[PDB]
Amino acid sequence: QLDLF
Amino acid sequence: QLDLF
Amino acid sequence: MKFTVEREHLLKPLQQVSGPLGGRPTLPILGNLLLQVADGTLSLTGTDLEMEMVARVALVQPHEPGATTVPARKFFDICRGLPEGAEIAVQLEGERMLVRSGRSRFSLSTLPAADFPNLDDWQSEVEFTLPQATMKRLIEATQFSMAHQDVRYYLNGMLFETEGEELRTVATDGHRLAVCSMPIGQSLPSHSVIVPRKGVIELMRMLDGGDNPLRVQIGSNNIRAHVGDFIFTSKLVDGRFPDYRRVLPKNPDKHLEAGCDLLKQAFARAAILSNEKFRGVRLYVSENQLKITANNPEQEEAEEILDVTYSGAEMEIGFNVSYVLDVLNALKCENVRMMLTDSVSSVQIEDAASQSAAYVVMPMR
Amino acid sequence: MKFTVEREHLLKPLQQVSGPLGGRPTLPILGNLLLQVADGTLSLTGTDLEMEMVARVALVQPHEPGATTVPARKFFDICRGLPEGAEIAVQLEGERMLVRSGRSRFSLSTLPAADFPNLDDWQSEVEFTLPQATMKRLIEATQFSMAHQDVRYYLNGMLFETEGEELRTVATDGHRLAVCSMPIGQSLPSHSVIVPRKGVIELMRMLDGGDNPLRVQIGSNNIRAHVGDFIFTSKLVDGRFPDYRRVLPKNPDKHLEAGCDLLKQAFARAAILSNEKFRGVRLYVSENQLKITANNPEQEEAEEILDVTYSGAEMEIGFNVSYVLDVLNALKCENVRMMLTDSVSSVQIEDAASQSAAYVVMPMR
């Protein structure tokens, strides 16, 4: 899971 | 609370 | 094993067989459904070891016999998730079950059919058929009176009793009792069995409401119900249920009649200000009048006065309001009859227009 | 303190002030409702020390001014439990409040009005009015994207942003974002505030659906909403919300369009066989086609193939299926547009026919 910020 | 039997 | 079936023919059977199954099963195979293809029929079985639900689905489309077990929730969700009118093609391929419909493909893990729990064979002692509505009525009329996780396990179930042409249900928690009798139209031998809580819940759930009659078979330690293409089987509770006949007030001197709704609403309001743990309310019966009072440890007080039909002697009786409300909510009639003896003896509550169901509540000192 | 009011005109106010008053309170007085009679108006107040609910009921019948605090749930239950059209006569009689209607009588324990928490007055910095339906839409379009008990506390709320004639809601958990803009027909200064989860829930709860417009007033550390004769006040989250404008993909090269339902159903089915914790699905985008795959640790596999409108380069992107489904369920439109960059960059999802709401979902690996 990658983060938006 | 009373009992039935 | 292989089969092709319309989604519509598979949905209700999958829902029904997933019934005995809970979120976290004891054994992993208990989270699975047993699928068996044989003679143009797909059998689906779900179990929790105490009870089983078997559904039979007719296969019109080509099929190959065989058996396997698949995760119930995942398989049901896949079929349910498929569009209306979808054709579901199922095939066993190794230790995986393949589910195909349109451009949707699923591979589910299997557990061997041989590992699936087999409920012991038994021969039916008493068999009868009855409308679904009759079974629903018998259960709904008494279910709430069953004990909740009581140490005396025999009270956590429902007694099913056959006598003459009547089927009767009895449920008691030791403080209150519910008894419902319904004619069956078949002369039956005298049999008395305890169906566990979960079996009772399953019996209710299986009743679709429709035209299909319900076929009941009772053995010495098991009960079976057939509805359409479903077969529910449950172990019975091995215990001796108390005699409801002894519990019933013999000749109540005092008879009170009241509108069920007005009586229910007055008790519901008074209940608000009763002890949160003991739920004690006081009933003051007098000529054509009922006064209900409640108070709690915070010293809050409720009072309700109703016009009732009563002509006997004035008396004060204490009751757990929850027990009274449970009866009034189970009744679903216009008027109710309360049959009283004295302040230390049980009340019998009924439909004023029907004796088929009787409710016995022991008072509070 | 004394008042007489018609049940149906006390019900909604009690439901709106007492409804949010839930669970075991910190202080006992927090479980109470402040009742104040003054100038032909009955004020009802519920508080949790942070959020406040005040309702004003016009007293068209004789009344005596005064104030007290009564258990909220018990008082609401009494009024609700009374019959249709009932006249509720209330009077303070010592350290107990008397509630009388017909032949129903209640005495409730009181706590002094002076002990009731009085929230400090504050000055509104921004104010505007808008239809209830607009507020409902703004919240419902983004609410699901709010973080659940995240350490970055400012993400557990919803940003309310005013800019020109628009009101905008933003919600993010750091993985997915939801932004909804609605024109409000009033020129507003540029303001940005974070409303806590519970304040958001209450703002939704207060929307009756009816003709009444909603008047919002935003202060430095508080927000208040007026709907009819009800005033909801909440403290704001003191934090800096991330900039949604930066989060939005700059100029995506790839654009996919699909029927929302077909897309949703395909994802819902693939979700069944995805990792229960990580919910990872894979999307394979190709000319006019989408292939969705999912597998879990038990090596179960799901595959879905759909016809989409896609004219671009073939790519494979991983997503938490729950995040995708949440967007597709929040959309409630015929067609959706997915705007993509690459496999390691966020997707923007929106209604193919509307830019009012945008959903940004960060992929996986």
XYZ file of C-alpha atoms in Angstrom, chain B residues 2, chain C residues 283 314-319 340-346 362-365:
19
model
C -39.824 -16.142 42.650
C -49.805 -4.014 39.672
C -58.351 -5.917 45.104
C -54.724 -7.130 45.088
C -51.093 -5.980 44.683
C -48.717 -8.128 42.567
C -45.114 -7.484 41.616
C -43.652 -8.528 38.279
C -54.409 -14.434 38.961
C -54.490 -16.364 42.257
C -52.633 -14.245 44.855
C -49.540 -11.963 45.205
C -47.106 -14.914 45.646
C -48.503 -17.169 42.874
C -47.965 -17.105 39.093
C -43.972 -16.017 38.380
C -44.286 -12.761 40.400
C -41.699 -10.730 42.336
C -41.833 -10.136 46.158
